[PDB]
Amino acid sequence: THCQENSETVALCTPRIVIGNLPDGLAPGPFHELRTWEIMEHMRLRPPP
Amino acid sequence: KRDEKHRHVVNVVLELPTEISEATHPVLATMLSKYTRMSSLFNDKCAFKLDLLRMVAVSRTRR
Amino acid sequence: DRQPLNPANIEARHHGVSDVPRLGAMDADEPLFVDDYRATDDEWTLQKV
Amino acid sequence: SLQFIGLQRRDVVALVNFLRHLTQKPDVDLEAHPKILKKCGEKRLHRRTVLFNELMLWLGYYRELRFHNPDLSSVLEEFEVRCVAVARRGYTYPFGDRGKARDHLAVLDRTEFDTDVRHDAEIVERALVSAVILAKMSVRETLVTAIGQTEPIAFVHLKDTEVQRIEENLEGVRRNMFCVKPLDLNLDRHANTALVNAVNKLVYTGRLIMNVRRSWEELERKCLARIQERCKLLVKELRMCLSFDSNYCRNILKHAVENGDSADTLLELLIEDFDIYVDSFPQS
């Protein structure tokens, strides 16, 4: 991003800590839900309790 | 005579029965001093009767 | 009326004291007797719904 | 007319005479005369009735200051004519590039008033900021181009004694707003160009109008908030006893106070039937 300081502009770079921080225009919610179902299938919880 | 005005209002404007009056119905006694001050509006009685109704309502409650 | 109302034509209702004059008006056109309470936008939209 | 009890009549007539002293006397602010907030009877009289006495005191003071409502008409005309003079001067003045000065002068040019009290407070500031931009550009002192920052409203190239007396007068205007007294024409006209002259006069009248308006509005706000507080305390204290009289007083109080007309309606509703709702209010 770009940030404001006293009468000045500054640039800011910071890390996206977790997968979810990726924008929902590039990593949309349905993709995340299907990935969760993939995890469920991995854990033999395909029908969850 | 304030008594004449009070009897006139009670009997004509408000049309109360003789068995209940400002002597035996104190909130009416307090409201009659206000009502006598309103010389006009004696032609329409329903407004005054409804006003006394809601005064009795606000006089008695537990909330 | 024939002309939009204004703060003078609107008059608040007293709801509990002997507001005789508005009773004497009752079926009156000119004065708009209204509660002093107001509807916020959200509850206004709920009414409209 | 106000009527309240608990006090000896001498203090009541002192309070009313004080309300008659209001328009002329300095420091027009209710908390700026603590002795009147002493004479309410607090820690002397009965709580339930003394808080009512204080409510009526605050309501009367609010009603008087609202009745005076500073009538800034001719100074508004002065502001508009100074604005037009600055506009003409800027259009004649040889600026560095026509676009920037033309735009600020245009937003200055069409700034005239609108027959509403509340909006003038915004538009006077909105005109002054652009005027100061223009004046700064005229004499090549800088202006802040940072996004989200507006160049502060101030004079340009006055000598410090003039602006010091301006600020002392502004403090005096803070103390009293109805006794408007602008006379600060110490401008020796060879002090910088005609544009500086006109913009200094414009910023002076704009700061005057803005200060008067804002002080009156904040006085309104404080009075309204505290009177609504007092109304809530009366309804709370009166709830403890259920009876026709206390219920009538409560139903009087359950009116809100968010407008000046609301306060007028409230005061007249209390006064009109003071023999209906007084039994529960004891003297001492």
UniProtKB/Swiss-Prot annotation, chain A:
Location relative to the cell: Virion; Host nucleus
Subunit field text: Homomultimer. Makes the hexons and eleven out of twelve pentons. Interacts with triplex proteins 1/TRX1 and 2/TRX2; adjacent capsomers are linked together in groups of three by triplexes, heterotrimeric complexes composed of one molecule of TRX1 and two molecules of TRX2. Interacts with scaffold protein; this interaction allows efficient MCP transport to the host nucleus. Interacts with capsid vertex component 2/CVC2. Interacts with the small capsomere-interacting protein/SCP.
Family of the protein in this entry: Belongs to the herpesviridae major capsid protein family.
Protein task: Self-assembles to form an icosahedral capsid with a T=16 symmetry, about 200 nm in diameter, and consisting of 150 hexons and 12 pentons (total of 162 capsomers). Hexons form the edges and faces of the capsid and are each composed of six MCP molecules. In contrast, one penton is found at each of the 12 vertices. Eleven of the pentons are MCP pentamers, while the last vertex is occupied by the portal complex.
Protein name: Major capsid protein
Organism: Human cytomegalovirus (strain AD169) (HHV-5)
Gene name of the record: MCP
Swiss-Prot record, chain B:
Keyword set includes Glycoprotein: no
Localization: Virion; Host nucleus
One Gene Ontology term from the biological process aspect of the record: viral process
Highest taxon listed in the record's lineage: Viruses
Record carries keyword S-adenosyl-L-methionine: no
Keywords attached to this entry: Capsid protein, Host nucleus, Virion
Annotated GO CC locations: host cell nucleus; viral capsid
Family of this protein: Belongs to the herpesviridae small capsomere-interacting protein family.
Role: Participates in the assembly of the infectious particles by decorating the outer surface of the capsid shell and thus forming a layer between the capsid and the tegument. Complexes composed of the major capsid protein and small capsomere-interacting protein/SCP assemble together in the host cytoplasm and are translocated to the nucleus, where they accumulate and participate in capsid assembly.
Assembly, per entry: Interacts with the major capsid protein/MCP.
Protein name as annotated: Small capsomere-interacting protein
Curated annotation (Swiss-Prot), chain D:
Membrane-spanning residues: none
Disulfide bond annotation, renumbered to this chain: none
Protein localization: Virion tegument; Host cytoplasm; Host nucleus
Post-translational modification: Phosphorylated by host CCNA2.
Quaternary context: Interacts with host BICD1 and RAB6A. Interacts with small capsid protein UL48A; this interaction links together the capsid and pp150. Interacts with host CCNA2.
Function: Participates in the last steps of viral maturation and release. Associates with nuclear capsids prior to DNA encapsidation and later preserves the integrity of nucleocapsids through secondary envelopment at the assembly compartment. Interacts with host CCNA2 and thereby blocks the onset of lytic gene expression to promote establishment of a quiescent state of infection in undifferentiated cells.
Similarity comment: Belongs to the herpesviridae large structural phosphoprotein family.
Protein's name in the database: Large structural phosphoprotein
Naturally occurring in which organism (per UniProt): Human cytomegalovirus (strain AD169) (HHV-5)
Gene behind this protein: UL32
